[PDB]
């Protein structure tokens, strides 16, 4: 059933045995039984084999052991019984084996240890007791063992350690007690453990720093974390000089002694986080083997200048969330690699601060108040790969010896507007720059976060030559025909009717829109091929604000004056005394256009979204601050006069419309309003586009029709008027008569 190794070794795995195997050679040396179904051990089960050395009973459910069953095994060395179903430590059947070496009792639900247990074992060296349900340390059975080396009691339910627990263990080397529920430690609990090297107390509920550790003279590695320790008194580590590793994290530490960490001749790393009230740098005299130093969350304001004159082998350095104001020189250091200084009050950089660090790779100085950086700062600094400096008021950024850089982030430095030289950064992989136009110099595989897409072009503002000539065309004739029509309507020395003065104001508003378009065309013509250079200055200056205000103002006056024109016509027909009434209404509407245009100016960043200074296209996120409001006002008005004119259609018949000159005026107004409706639908649709997730159009296209479909009325309204109202011809003859009389 079980194979024979030939060297006196017998192995049994999952062969369904409920009793001890028999018939094997009496000279076998090692016996393993695992995964079978033995539940009880009969008396004199192992009397057959007198030369057994190592004994494995793994995984089966043994529950009862006869006291005399284990007798006769005087040479047994290793005994393993884990994951079985014993409930108490077998004080009997164990006293016989004098020459036992290692004993493993894991995963067995054990609650009580008999007093006379572990008696007669004179040379036991390893004893494993974890994952059980122990509730108090077996002081007497432990004292019974004088030659124990390694002790593990983990995951048990111990609550407190009484005094003089481990007096008689002279040669104990390592002690593991983690995940227990210890909360109090006596001052003399650990006496006698002179040769203890490793001490583990993790995840316990310690509420105050223990003192008994000062009795240990040769404690190498010490680990406690996730506890509730909050205060580190000075002189704590005085007793034990040699400490390679100190584990502490997740503790809610508040105060740490000035001289606590002093005179540790062999400590390797030091980490302190969350210690808020500590405000003065620790005294590190005598510690000359510190690879890594980390202090976070404190109130430190200054740094000693002998720091790495002492620390000759420091490799990394991080100091963030402090109140550091000035930086002492780091010239002495040679092995320093990574430096992090964030959320501090640094405001200037000097040449000498970073001089002499040969092997510095990663440098971070983010979220500070630095505004002055010397040109020669970074000049003789060695090969540096990743440099991050952002969210600081910075005016000019030098570049000397940065050719080896790979990662460079500068975002939030709105004061920085100078372009970036492409030749210097030869091996740059990832950029972050505050304004998208700067990346146009690289024209990128370089990665620049800012989108620098169509809405923010590099070479031409208007893009296509056809679009350029088209806007040039409507600009011109809008201007010329608007001037002609206003001269015809106003220069005549005749009484001015309400409708005539109304169309005059229409002409004035359309003229304003036209020279807004003209100023845009002038900018495009001037900045041909090099828009990237001028973009930042143009958007930041007041010109963009002026242009946007002009456009917005021109577009509201036209709409409101048209609405007032068609109710003027409606009630004029109806009374067929409101002339002065409507004149000041027109004035009041002009004032409203003025204030509506100037309202966004007091806000921040509303007019700088696009180089065109028109907010209605918006962008990635215009987040409808007032765009939705404006389109709502425009649509509601249009539907109002749509209803008004439908009512007029119902009231007055078509034959009277054909035979009435006032109705010819009505037809002209109807043409005007219909044109205004269809030419304003597209911009409203574009503003509604981001609200719907399904619809998406390329910035190429939305820019083109936003450019084309905005100013058309300023062009066709005067053309419509002169082409289809002989009223203009009559005024033309009148002004010809006046000119002939003058000349």
């Amino acid at each position, epitope marked *: 059933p079980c194979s024979c190794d030939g060297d006196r070794r017998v192995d049994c795995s999952g062969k369904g045995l409920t009793a001890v195997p028999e018939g094997l050679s009496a000279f076998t040396q090692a016996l393993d039984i695992s995964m079978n179904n033995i539940t009880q051990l009969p008396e004199d089960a192992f009397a057959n084999f007198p030369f057994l050395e190592e004994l494995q009973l793994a995984g089966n459910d043994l529950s009862f052991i006869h006291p005399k069953a284990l007798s006769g095994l005087k040479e047994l060395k290793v005994l393993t019984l884990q994951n079985n179903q014993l409930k108490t430590v077998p004080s009997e059947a164990i006293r016989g084996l004098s020459a036992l070496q290692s004993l493993r009792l894991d995963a067995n639900h054990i609650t009580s240890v008999p007093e006379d247990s572990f008696e007669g074992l004179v040379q036991l060296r390893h004893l494993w007791l974890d994952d059980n349900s122990l509730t108090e340390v077996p002081v007497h059975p432990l004292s019974n063992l004088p030659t124990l*080396q*390694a002790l593990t009691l983990a995951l048990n339910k111990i609550s407190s350690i009484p005094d003089f627990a481990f007096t008689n263990l002279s040669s104990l080397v*390592v002690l593991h007690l983690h995940n227990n529920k210890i909360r109090s430690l006596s001052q003399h609990c650990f006496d006698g453990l002179d040769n203890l090297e*490793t001490l583990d107390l993790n995840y316990n509920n310690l509420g105050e720093f223990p003192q008994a550790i000062k009795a240990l003279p040769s404690l190498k*590695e010490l680990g406690f974390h996730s506890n509730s320790i909050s205060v580190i008194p000075d002189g704590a580590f005085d007793g034990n000089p040699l400490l390679r*590793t100190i584990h502490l994290y997740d503790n809610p530490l508040s105060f740490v002694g000035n001289s606590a960490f002093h005179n540790l001749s062999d400590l390797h790393s030091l980490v302190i986080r969350g210690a808020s009230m500590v405000q003065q740098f620790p005294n590190l005299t005598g510690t000359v083997h510190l690879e890594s130093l980390t202090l976070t969350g404190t109130k430190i304001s200054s740094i000693p200048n002998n720091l790495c004159q002492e620390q000759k082998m420091l490799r990394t350095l991080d100091l963030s969330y402090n109140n550091i104001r000035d930086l002492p020189s780091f010239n002495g250091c040679h092995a320093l690699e990574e430096i992090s200084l964030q959320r501090n009050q640094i405001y200037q950089i000097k040449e000498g601060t970073f001089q002499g660090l040969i092997s510095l790779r990663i440098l971070d100085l983010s979220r500070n108040l630095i505004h002055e950086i010397h040109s020669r700062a970074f000049a003789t600094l060695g090969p540096i790969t990743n440099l991050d400096v952002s969210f600081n008021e910075l005016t000019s950024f030098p570049t000397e010896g940065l050719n080896g850089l790979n990662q460079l982030k500068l975002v939030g430095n709105f004061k920085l507007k100078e372009a970036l030289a492409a030749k210097d950064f030869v091996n740059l992989r990832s950029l972050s720059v505050p304004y998208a136009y700067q990346c146009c110099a690289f024209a990128g595989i370089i990665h620049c976060t800012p989108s620098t897409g169509a809405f923010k072009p590099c070479e031409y503002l208007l893009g296509s030559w056809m679009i350029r000539l088209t806007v040039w065309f409507i600009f011109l004739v809008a201007l010329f025909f608007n001037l002609l029509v206003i001269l015809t309507t106003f220069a005549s020395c005749t009484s001015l009717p309400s409708s005539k003065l109304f169309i005059g104001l229409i002409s004035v508003s359309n003229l304003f829109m036209g020279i807004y378009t003209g100023i845009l065309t002038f900018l495009d013509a001037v900045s041909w091929g090099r828009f990237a250079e001028f973009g930042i200055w143009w958007e930041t200056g007041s010109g963009c604000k002026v242009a946007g205000f002009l456009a917005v103002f021109s577009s509201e006056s036209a709409i409101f004056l048209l609405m007032l024109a068609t109710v003027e016509r409606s009630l004029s027909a109806k009374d067929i005394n409101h002339l002065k009434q409507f004149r000041v209404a027109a004035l009041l509407a002009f004032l409203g256009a003025t204030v509506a245009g100037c309202f966004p100016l007091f806000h921040r960043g509303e007019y700088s979204a696009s180089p065109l200074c028109l907010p209605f296209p918006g962008g990635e996120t215009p987040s409808l601050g007032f765009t939705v409001t404006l389109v709502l006002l425009n649509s509601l008005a249009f539907l109002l006069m749509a209803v008004i004119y439908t009512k007029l259609y119902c009231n007055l018949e078509k034959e009277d419309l054909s035979e009435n000159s006032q109705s010819s005026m009505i037809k002209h107004v109807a043409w005007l309003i219909f044109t205004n409706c269809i030419f304003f639908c597209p911009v409203a649709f574009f503003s509604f586009a981001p609200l719907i997730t399904a619809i998406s159009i390329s910035p190429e296209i939305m820019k083109s029709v936003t450019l084309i479909f905005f100013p058309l009325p300023a062009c066709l309204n005067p053309v419509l008027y002169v082409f289809f109202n002989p009223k203009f011809k009559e005024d033309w003859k009148l002004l010809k008569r006046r000119v002939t009389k003058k000349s």
Partner: nanobody
Amino acid sequence: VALAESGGGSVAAGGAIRLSCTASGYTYSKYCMGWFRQAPGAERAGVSGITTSPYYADSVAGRFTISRDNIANTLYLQMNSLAPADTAMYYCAASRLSCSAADFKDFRNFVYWGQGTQVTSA
């Protein structure tokens, strides 16, 4: 004390592989073990580890299983659907103190190291 590993070799992409490590001794803490990956020209990195919620690396998430059997004191790591970037040398590391997940991205804490194996994926 002594650590030994078995497994490894050359496998076409998308295969499955099992790596088994055995340990002998008593000083090590059975609640801190890890598998470490090394590619030439770079320092060791921690692929996976057992802590007391196993710690898994960013990259190998969803394709790597780590298990421990204290019945026979063996550590198992099974991989499936490998990518060629997984071709490297593998180590088993055991500590002397209990450890958390935060201790696994720094190898210097671990002390007991194995001889290692080599696995290549095509």
